[PDB]
Amino acid sequence: LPLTTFQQKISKYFNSRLFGHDIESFINRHKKFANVSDEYLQYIFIEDISSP
Amino acid sequence: LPLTTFQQKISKYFNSRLFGHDIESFINRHKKFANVSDEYLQYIFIEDISSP
Structure with a gap:
């Protein structure tokens, strides 16, 4: 996620x-950041994890 | 290098x-410091020398 x-x-x-x-x-x-340094976060929210 | x-x-x-x-x-x-008109450091990149 950004x-x-x-x-x-x-x-x-x-x-x-x-x-x-x-x-x-x-x-x-x-x-x-899925790297040493990037512009995105490897995390999700409750309303997103509920959705498929 | 600058x-x-x-x-x-x-x-x-x-x-x-x-x-x-x-x-x-x-x-x-x-x-x-020193060299040209700005500071200089003694460092080279391993990825650059590894690449052709």
Whole structure:
């Protein structure tokens, strides 16, 4: 999943003003790129894993 | 080789927003300055010499 898509989906889920560095800490803890460095995150959401 | 082309070559392996602190850390660790009009480092890329 793209980082921008992840960020916008988490922003529409939870307000990004109240929750600040929490999301960046979460991604810095558990983010990959399917490479040494890229622009995509190997993670999925609940509404996406529910869908086939 | 100049720092700008060093960055251009390294942009395809490591992302700056990932580890810019570490990138500048090793850059200053191995900085030698001098040559031309900008700083120069003693480093070559294993992938480049491996490729024809």
